[PDB]
Amino acid sequence: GLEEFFDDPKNWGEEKVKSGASWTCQQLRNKSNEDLHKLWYVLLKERNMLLTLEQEAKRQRLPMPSPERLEKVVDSMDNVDKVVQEREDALRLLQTGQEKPRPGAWRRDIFGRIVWHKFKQWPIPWYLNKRYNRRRFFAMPYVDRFIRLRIEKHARIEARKRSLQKKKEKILHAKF
Amino acid sequence: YRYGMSRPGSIADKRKNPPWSRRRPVVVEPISDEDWHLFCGDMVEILEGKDAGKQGKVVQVVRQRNWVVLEGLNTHYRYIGRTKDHRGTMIASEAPLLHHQVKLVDPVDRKPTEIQWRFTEAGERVRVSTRSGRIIPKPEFPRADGIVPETWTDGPKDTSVEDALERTYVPRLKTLEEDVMEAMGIQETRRFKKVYWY
Amino acid sequence: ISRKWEKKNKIVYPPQLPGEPRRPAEIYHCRRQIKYSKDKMWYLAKMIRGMSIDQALAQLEFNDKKGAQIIKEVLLEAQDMAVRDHNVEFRSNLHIAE
Amino acid sequence: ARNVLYPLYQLGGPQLRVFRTNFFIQLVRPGTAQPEDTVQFRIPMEMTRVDLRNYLEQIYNVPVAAVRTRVQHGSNRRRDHKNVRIKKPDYKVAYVQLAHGQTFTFPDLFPSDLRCPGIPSWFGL
Amino acid sequence: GIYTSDRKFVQIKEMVPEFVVPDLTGFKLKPYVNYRAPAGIDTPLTAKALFQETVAPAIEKDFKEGTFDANNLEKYGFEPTQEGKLFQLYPKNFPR
Amino acid sequence: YRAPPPPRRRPGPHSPDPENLLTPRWQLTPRY
Amino acid sequence: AFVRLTLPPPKVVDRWNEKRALFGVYDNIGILGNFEKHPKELIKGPVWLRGWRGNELQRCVRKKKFVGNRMFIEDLHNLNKRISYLYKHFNRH
Amino acid sequence: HLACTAGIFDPYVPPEGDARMLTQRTERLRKNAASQLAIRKIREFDANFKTKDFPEKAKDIFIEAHLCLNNSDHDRLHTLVTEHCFPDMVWDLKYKTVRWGFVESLEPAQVVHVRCNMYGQVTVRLHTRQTLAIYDRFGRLMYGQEDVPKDVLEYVVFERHLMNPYGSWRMHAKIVPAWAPPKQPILKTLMIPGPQLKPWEEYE
RNA sequence: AACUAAUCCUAGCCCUAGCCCUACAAAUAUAAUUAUACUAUUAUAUAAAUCAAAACAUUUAUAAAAGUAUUGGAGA
C-alpha cells in the first residue's frame, strides 16, 4: 500500500522514532527457512519507507529522524542473507562438494597472472563458440620479462618497506 | 594523521588534520592488546598531571595516542555559551592522560598497584596486582545509547522479546528457496535445456 | 603575514601615578585585506595626515575614489573603538596622527 | 533484484521467479507538476518498468494504470580538492499512474550597570 | 525479452521475473528487535553441521540396524545431480 | 665490558655433500 | 639565506660504549694467532671488495663478476653501460 | 562536567536597617527552622560547618580572590571562586590595571542563610571598607580613588560540592540588598543616544 | 614591535648487509572491461648502430700466471 511507504502520521515531525536493536545472526538462524523469507520482506518494507522518508528529507533539506533505524534494518537484512546463504552453502557442499555456487577455475591471462575465471553458461558449446575461442586465456612469451619485473618489484617494495620503518624508528628515538 | 581528542573524521579533526597537513608525526609507543590494561569505567590513579594522585573513572580511551580520559580530572577551564549578548560560562574541560600517567586501583586498598594480566577459570582475562594479588573485575559501563536493555519498551516495528528468542528452524535437507516452495506450494515443471558452462 | 599593528593596539601602559599627567590616547587601527592598490590608497593617506577626525570625515564624504569610501569606514570603525575601548570622552577630540 | 545473476532462458525453460527482492525504491514528492494519481518513484537504474508494475502490484498490492520512467544524468562537474571530478549517482525517476480511479497526494512529512560601566556587576565596591 | 527481426521487441514471459511475496500477516518478525532481547551465540550452519543434524541420525540408526549400503546413499539425501530442481545449488540457476 | 671470544675456525676434515646445490663444483672434484 | 630561530636540544654521547671501547680488538689476530687468520679475513661487507681494493673501474668490474648472475637484468644492463663510461675515462684520458 | 550551578537555590531577603545591626544572630535561630535542616545537610558531609565560624573562612576567600585581581592571578582565583563567579570578576577588568585593598571590616562577618547531585550555597553578610582604583590602558585613572576607604555592605554566596570527597567552599555569587546605595560613578561622562530613524520616518 | 616576507623537521629517499623465489556485486580480450552464439585463435630473427680508431673500410672490453705471450687498417 501507498501508506506503507510513509511513516506513522503521529511520528511525522518527531525528532526521533523509538526503535529497538537490529536482528542478530543467531536469532535468524533459530528461525525457520520460511520465516527467514517472510522476515526479509518485512525488513525490506521498513527500509524502503526509511529510504522513502530520507529522500523526501533530502528534497526538503531536512534531517532524517532516528537515522540509526535504517542502519539497524540493513544489519537485520544483511544478517538474514548470510544465514540463508549459510544454509544454501552447507547443502550445496554436501550434495556436490563445490565450494562455489557458480562453476569456475583458475586461468592464466595474457599478462601471466593467475586469476579465478568464472565459467559462463552459453547456448552453444565452446568449440562451436568462435568468440569464446577468440577470447585469450594464454600468456605471450614476452611476459617472462614482466614476470621477472614483478618479482623485482616485490623485492623493491620490501626494500622500500624497510626504509619506511627506518625513518619511523628515527623519530621514536627523537620523541623518546 | 595525528590522533587528537577530537573523534577522527569530525569537523575539529578535519581542522586538526587537513588534507595538506604534513606535520612532524608524534610517535606513540605501541601497546599490545594484552599489554593494554586501561578500559573505560576503570578507576585509576593519576601518576602525573594537573590532578596527579586523584583517582578517577575512565570515560574515553584513545588507544592510538595511548590516552586515557578521566571525567572531571586533568581539567582546565573554558567558556561555554560565549556569544555577543553574553560573555559565557566557565566549565570543566578534561585533557588526555597518557597510559604511563595513570595506574589501576586495587578495590579493597586504594593505591596505584602495578598489575599483571592473567586468565581466570571462565577464561576471561583479568588484571592481577603484582603486589597484594587480587582480581580487578571489569567495570560496568552503561550502553552508549543510554538504553538499559531490560528497561527498554518495544516501540513500533519492534519484535517482542519472546518472538526473537523463539527457534523454529528444523534441520532438513532443503534450502530456504525449496522450503518456501513447500509452504506456498510453488511448482515448476519446465526445465532448462543443456547449457555448456565456459 | 605579520599583524603587529594590532599588537600595538594591545599595548597596556603601567598605571599612572596621581602626580603624573593624563596620557594622551593612541589608537592603532588597520584593514589588512583591501582589493585596492596601496599607492592609490597612500595618496588618500598622505593628504589626511595630521587632520582632525571631523575634518577627515567631511573630506572623505565628498571624495569620488573607492578607496576614500573604504577609509571612511575604517576611520569610523577606529573612532567607535576609540570611544568604546580607549576611553575617548569626546568624539570630536580626535585627529589623524598617522 | 540488482547486482545478481539471472538464469539464462532457453525454449521451454522455467518461468523466472524472484523469491527475495534486492530492489529498493523511494517515493518522492513530484519535482515537476504531475496529475494527482501519478506518483513519482526513485528506483534502481537496472529495474524495468514492468518490474515496478509487478513490484507495486505484488509487494504493495497497489493497482497501477500507467508508468512513465526517465533517467536523470548525474552532474560530474563537481571536483574534489585534488581537482578530480565527482559524479552524482544517476537515478531513475518513475511516474506511476494509479488504477481503479485511485488518487495520491504526497503526505506532509516534517509538518554590569550602564551608569557604572567597566566595573563588573560582581563588584559591590 | 527478445528482440526479433526488424528490431521489434517481443517480451518473453519466462524471462520476466515474478515477485514471490511472502504472507506477512500474523508474522511476528519485524524490522527491529527490542533492546530487551538478548543476542544469541553465533552458530553458523555448515556442511558438516547440516550432515550431523540431518544425515547422521539416519545413517547411525541404519548402521546399527545393519540396513546401510552404498546403493542407498541417495536415500539419506545425496543428490547425484542438481538438475530438475527449480533451485539448483550448483550451477546456480535461480535468482535470490 | 668483556671482549668477545676470539674467532675459532672449524677444525678437521669436512666432506662436502655432492647432492647439495650450494656446494661448488671444484669442491667435488677428485683433486679436492 | 635565513637561519633557524630555535636551538637544537642538547645531545650527550658515550665514548666508552662497547663498540667504541672494543674497537680495534683482535686486530693483531695474525701476529698473536700464529698468522692462522689474516686480518684481511676479518673484513665484513660487499663480497667483491672483502680484503680487496681497486679503482672505480676495477671495483665495478669485480662487482659485476661476483654478483653478475645474481643481479637484476635491468641493473646488469645499466652496469654494463656504466662500465663503458668508466673504461673510456680511465683508459683513454 | 559542572562543579557549580548558576543561581541561588533560594534568595535570602535582607531586612532594611541590618547595617545598623545578638539580635540578627537570633533571627537565624528563628529562621534556623528554614535553614538549620540545610545546615545539617552540609554538616552530614562535613560535620565541621558552623554558621559562627564559616564567615572567617569565607572572608579570607573573598579578600584573597580580590587580591588576585591586582596581580591578575587567574589560576589562583579559579580555586577561590566557582566557575560561574570567575568570569564576572575579571571580564570587565580586561586591559585595565587595578589597585585594590581591604580596610578593616566595619562589623564581623556572619552566615545569613544556606541552601542545598547536591550543591550547598551559603549566604554570608559582609560589611567592609575597601580601596579601589582602576586605570586605563595608558594608566589614566578611570574609577575610584587610590587610597580612599569606601564602606560597602553586601551578602556573598559561597558554594561547595557536597558529594565530592574533595569538595570545598568556593565563592559563587553575591546578593546585593536593595537598601544598599548605588556604587560610585565612573569619572568619565556617558551619552544616551537619541532614536535613529530612516529618512521618511519622523522624530519620536 | 611595519607591510610584503621569513622561520621549522619529517615526507621519504640512497647504498650495502641479509634474504631469492616456490602467497564486493557486476563487467571483461567481441570494439577488453558490452549479462548468451557472429569472426576462429598468436609473440619472436646475429642485437645493431651510436660509439673508438681524432674521418672511414677489417676491427672497437662491457686467486696467481697476467694485462704477459699471442691477436689486430700490428692501430684504436
From Swiss-Prot, chain C:
Question: What is the superkingdom listed in this entry's lineage?
Answer: Eukaryota
Q: How does it assemble?
A: Component of the mitochondrial ribosome large subunit (39S) which comprises a 16S rRNA and about 50 distinct proteins.
Family membership noted in the UniProt record? Belongs to the universal ribosomal protein uL22 family.
Query: What is the protein named?
Result: Large ribosomal subunit protein uL22m
Lineage, broadest ranks: Eukaryota, Metazoa, Chordata, Craniata, Vertebrata
Please give the range of the full-length protein represented by this chain. Answer: 41 to 138 of 206
Location relative to the cell: Mitochondrion
Native source species? Mus musculus (Mouse)
Curated annotation (Swiss-Prot), chain D:
Q: Which GO terms describe its molecular function?
A: structural constituent of ribosome
Give the matching Pfam families: Ribosomal_L23
Keyword set includes Ribonucleoprotein: yes
SUPFAM superfamilies registered for this protein in UniProt:
Ribosomal proteins S24e, L23 and L15e
Q: Where in the cell is it found?
A: Mitochondrion
Q: Which GO terms describe its cellular component?
A: cytosolic ribosome; mitochondrial inner membrane; mitochondrial large ribosomal subunit; mitochondrion
Q: Which GO terms describe its biological process?
A: mitochondrial translation; translation
Keywords noted in UniProt: Mitochondrion, Ribonucleoprotein, Ribosomal protein
Report whether Electron transport shows up as a keyword of the record.
no
Q: How does it assemble?
A: Component of the mitochondrial ribosome large subunit (39S) which comprises a 16S rRNA and about 50 distinct proteins.
**Family as reported in the entry's similarity comment:** Belongs to the universal ribosomal protein uL23 family.
Q: Which PANTHER family match?
A: LARGE RIBOSOMAL SUBUNIT PROTEIN UL23M, RIBOSOMAL PROTEIN L23-RELATED
What name does this protein carry?
Large ribosomal subunit protein uL23m
Organism (species): Mus musculus (Mouse)
The top of its lineage is:
Eukaryota, Metazoa, Chordata, Craniata, Vertebrata
Q: Which gene encodes it?
A: Mrpl23
Swiss-Prot record, chain G:
Entry GO MF terms: structural constituent of ribosome
Q: Does the keyword Transit peptide apply?
A: yes
* Keyword Ribonucleoprotein (UniProt): yes
Query: What are the record keywords, sorted?
Result: Mitochondrion, Ribonucleoprotein, Ribosomal protein, Transit peptide
Q: The organism sits in which domain of life?
A: Eukaryota
GO CC terms of this entry: mitochondrial inner membrane; mitochondrial large ribosomal subunit; mitochondrial ribosome; mitochondrion
What does the UniProt entry say about where the protein is found? Mitochondrion
Q: Name one GO biological process term.
A: mitochondrial translation
Q: Give the record's subunit note.
A: Component of the mitochondrial ribosome large subunit (39S) which comprises a 16S rRNA and about 50 distinct proteins. Interacts with OXA1L.
The family this protein is said to belong to: Belongs to the mitochondrion-specific ribosomal protein mL51 family.
- Name of the featured protein: Large ribosomal subunit protein mL51
Annotated gene: Mrpl51
The shown chain, on whole-protein numbering, covers 32 to 124 of 128
Swiss-Prot record, chain H:
Q: Which organism is it from?
A: Mus musculus
Q: What does this protein do?
A: Component of the mitochondrial large ribosomal subunit (mt-LSU). Within the mitochondrial ribosomes, required to direct the nascent polypeptide toward the tunnel exit and position the exit at a distance from the membrane surface.
Tell me one GO molecular function of this protein.
structural constituent of ribosome
Record localization: Mitochondrion
Q: Which UniProt keywords apply?
A: Mitochondrion, Ribonucleoprotein, Ribosomal protein, Transit peptide
Q: What is this protein called?
A: Large ribosomal subunit protein mL45
UniProt record, GO biological process: mitochondrial translation
Principal location listed in the UniProt entry: mitochondrion
Q: Which family does it belong to?
A: Belongs to the mitochondrion-specific ribosomal protein mL45 family.
Query: Listed GO cellular component terms?
Result: mitochondrial inner membrane; mitochondrial large ribosomal subunit; mitochondrion
The protein's assembly and partners: Component of the mitochondrial ribosome large subunit (39S) which comprises a 16S rRNA and about 50 distinct proteins.
Q: Which domain of life is it from?
A: Eukaryota
Phylogenetic classification of the source organism: Eukaryota, Metazoa, Chordata, Craniata, Vertebrata
Q: Which section of the whole protein is represented?
A: 77 to 294 of 306
Recorded name of the encoding gene? Mrpl45
